[PDB]
């Protein structure tokens, strides 16, 4: 029973660590959207002014 309890402790640490990696990867994925949407808006306004 104590060996199974030790295995359960290790299992939840591996699960939490796997979710931690996924949380950070979703943040990296989100950062690229924030930066590229700013680029397209800024370049579009630059063309708006250039045509005028």
């Amino acid at each position: 029973d104590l060996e199974l309890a030790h295995e359960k402790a290790g299992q939840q640490l591996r699960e939490a660590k796997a979710q931690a990696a996924e949380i950070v990867e979703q943040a990296k994925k989100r950062a690229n959207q924030i930066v590229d949407e700013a680029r397209d808006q800024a370049r579009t306004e630059g063309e708006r002014l250039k045509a005028q």
Partner: protein, 51 residues
């Protein structure tokens, strides 16, 4: 954007300046080609002899 708007604006002034300068030189050539005669050499050849 803004800097490039100023980049184009000054380039247009220079394109005009390049044509106006050619016309001003042509104008001076046509004016001198009619305003100069024997009465000018006594004021130019005489000037060079001191230079």
């Amino acid at each position: 954007a803004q800097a490039e708007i100023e980049q184009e604006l000054n380039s247009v002034k220079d394109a005009l300046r390049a044509q106006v300068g050619a016309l001003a030189v042509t104008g001076a050539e046509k004016i001198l080609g009619a305003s100069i005669d024997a009465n000018a050499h006594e004021q130019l050849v005489s000037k060079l002899a001191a230079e």
